[PDB]
């Protein structure tokens, strides 16, 4: 579970807070107009007094994150998203000096629900993956040189819900294949294809309507006889004459 953690220090050992404050407790001095230090330090103190409480904040998050987190299957490497998420220091500031002996946590029922979801999702991702792979590989040893590209990919993403394809850079969808076409295959999936191929031939000729090619001899040739058809012209063996796929 790659779930980037953080200082036990931060955790509840909190002090960082106590130090964040002590460092503040000695910033009260000259340089420019008076309407300045006055206003400035006065604000600072409101952090100090509240510090007793600000402590509590650290604890809170510490736990919560440290809790919720647990129930996450979806690994999580740290990446530089392409989108932000605006955060007005406005609210920040409020939360800060504005919290008292409050104490809340995740309702049991709440937690599960969380697990459950990531779960499903995961399962879907993983599963479709297999569903995906299986197909593509088959797609190659079948010489179905055609769809292989998009076709499969499209369905794939759709079933994953989450994103609306379309706005997927073309470099992405294909690159997606490039990665997929390099994995094993749920024994289940795989184990079956191996089966179909082995019998494949047998089915095809074993059908009523349709047979494999014909031969030309321009040589008054002798018709054969077979119980099931009577007097007919078959020949289960083409050998001795070129073959033209």
């Amino acid at each position: 579970n790659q779930v980037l953690n953080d200082n036990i220090r931060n955790g509840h050992v909190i002090n960082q807070l106590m130090e964040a404050l002590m460092q503040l407790s000695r910033q009260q001095f000259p340089t420019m107009p008076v309407d300045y230090k006055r206003s400035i330090q006065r604000g600072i103190l409101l952090l100090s007094n509240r510090l007793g409480q600000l402590v509590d904040l650290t604890r809170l998050l510490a736990y919560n994150y440290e809790t919720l987190m647990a129930c996450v299957t979806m690994n999580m490497q740290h990446v530089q998203t392409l989108t932000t998420e605006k955060l007005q220091l406005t609210s920040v500031t409020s939360l800060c000096m504005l919290i008292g002996n409050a104490t809340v946590i995740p309702s049991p029922q709440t937690l599960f629900h969380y697990y459950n979801v990531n779960v499903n999702f995961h399962s879907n991702y993983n599963e479709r993956i297999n569903d995906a792979v299986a197909i593509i590989t088959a797609a190659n040893r079948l010489n179905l040189y055609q769809k292989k590209m998009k076709a499969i990919v499209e369905d794939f993403l759709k079933r994953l819900h989450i994103f609306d394809v379309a706005r997927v850079p073309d470099d992405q969808m294909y690159r997606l294949r490039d990665r997929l076409r390099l994995l094993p295959v749920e024994v289940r999936r795989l184990d079956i294809f191996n089966l179909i191929l082995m019998n494949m031939d047998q089915i095809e000729r074993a059908s009523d309507k349709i047979a494999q090619g014909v031969i030309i001899a321009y040589r008054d040739m002798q018709l054969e006889r077979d119980e099931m058809y009577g007097y007919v012209n078959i020949a289960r063996n083409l050998d001795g004459f070129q073959q033209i796929n």
Binding site: T137, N140, R141, R181, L182, L183, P184, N194
Partner: protein, 397 residues
């Protein structure tokens, strides 16, 4: 190190299971493993060689992967692969060789080369696999700690030693008594001679003894013990102990009497055999003691009586002997033997590249010198160096 191993069984189980035809299904579990490697690699740069007359080739990587497509290999697939393997082959060679020469007193049991010191790195471990090659199997078990073990045919445990000890001698060397022997490899031949044919000896019997101390314990040894020492059954002119003159040995052979072979371990008798010739088992020992006697024949036909007079000159010298050969055995330490090419590989690579004598191994990797003073440092270096030779022989012979 373990890293190194993989790099090979990778290629062998590769250059072997990949040919025009075969179904993909015989390599799915294989292909994968392979690729994984390529990735970890390319991007990192290497340097090999320098010391002695050994070229310094620099190596870069950035090779595309494979296909999981075709479920029936087409010739074209092979060639585009063999061309990528032949860079790893010609590589590894230059890699083995580089760490197959550097020695270190202090901690000369671990990696040395700028090539390998970088391999033991962590970001590489992502490869290790199929450790069924007798040698690696043993390298690991040694890292953790456990009853290791190897298998040898005609092992090379005895440093060459060919000498004699005169228990009774005089300036003229006309009435000697003593033993002469040859300890070499897996064989011992020892003869006890008494020019007087025990004429004045108590019970007309002269006792002999030959003790050989192994530098390493051998276990599960299958041994051939035969009476007589053919090597010391013919006339010889030998240098005296002080090198000042030469004496004459004119043997006549009698059966060794009261033969007793003891295989001891730390002074304790583990196996003892009384006059048993043929095949015997010595299960655990660090010392062999051969005791045998010359007993003057109590009854002699005229022709025999004539060889053994009551007074000097003693012209026919009564001799009894034994021959002992260790056909196979197990040793917890690496050793040279009559089948493995390890010693020869290491010695050969060093000789070919004019590698200077180092601080650990005797000049020329001389076996006798090595086994005579088989220090812990020499053994650790020898094992490292033998294990590398074995990794190399999986691809290059």
């Amino acid at each position: 190190m373990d890293v190194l191993y993989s790099l090979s069984k990778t290629l062998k189980d590769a250059r072997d299971k990949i040919v025009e035809g075969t179904l993909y299904s015989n390599v799915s579990d294989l292909i994968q493993q392979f690729n994984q490697m390529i990735i970890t690699m390319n991007g990192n740069e290497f340097q090999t060689g320098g010391i002695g007359n050994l070229p310094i080739r620099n190596w870069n990587f950035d090779f595309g992967l494979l296909g999981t497509t075709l479920l029936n290999l087409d010739a074209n697939y092979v060639e585009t692969a063999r061309n990528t393997i032949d860079y790893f082959v010609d590589f590894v060679d230059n890699v083995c060789m580089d760490e197959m020469v550097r020695e270190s007193q202090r901690n000369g049991i671990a990696p040395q080369s700028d090539s390998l010191r970088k391999l033991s790195g962590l970001k590489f471990k992502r490869i290790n696999f199929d450790n069924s090659s007798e040698y690696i199997e043993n390298w690991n078990l040694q890292n953790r700690r456990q009853r290791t073990g190897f298998t040898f045919h005609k092992p090379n445990i005895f440093p060459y030693s060919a000498s004699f000890t005169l228990n009774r001698s005089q300036p003229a060397h006309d009435n000697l008594m003593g033993t002469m022997w040859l300890n070499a490899g897996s064989e011992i031949q020892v003869a006890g001679f008494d020019y007087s044919c025990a004429i004045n000896a108590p019970a007309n019997t002269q006792q002999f003894e030959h003790i050989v101390q192994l530098r390493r314990v051998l276990t599960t040894a299958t041994i051939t013990l035969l009476p007589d020492a053919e090597r010391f059954s013919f006339p010889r002119v030998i240098n005296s102990a002080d090198g000042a003159t030469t004496w004459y040995f004119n043997p006549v052979i009698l059966r060794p009497n009261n033969v007793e072979v003891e295989f001891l371990l730390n002074g304790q008798i583990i196996n003892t055999y009384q006059a048993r010739f043929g095949t015997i088992i010595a299960r655990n020992f660090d010392t062999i003691r051969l005791s045998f006697q010359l007993m003057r024949p109590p009854n002699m036909t005229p022709a025999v009586a004539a060889l053994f007079p009551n007074a000097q000159p003693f012209e026919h010298h009564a001799t009894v002997g034994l021959t002992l050969r260790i056909e196979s055995a197990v040793c917890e330490s690496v050793l040279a033997d009559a089948s493995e090419t390890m010693l020869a590989n290491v010695t050969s690579v060093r000789q070919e590249y004019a590698i200077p004598v180092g601080p650990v191994f005797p000049p020329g990797m001389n076996w006798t010198d090595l086994i005579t003073n088989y220090s812990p440092s020499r053994e650790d270096n020898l094992q490292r160096v033998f294990t590398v030779a074995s990794i190399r022989s999986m691809l290059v012979k």
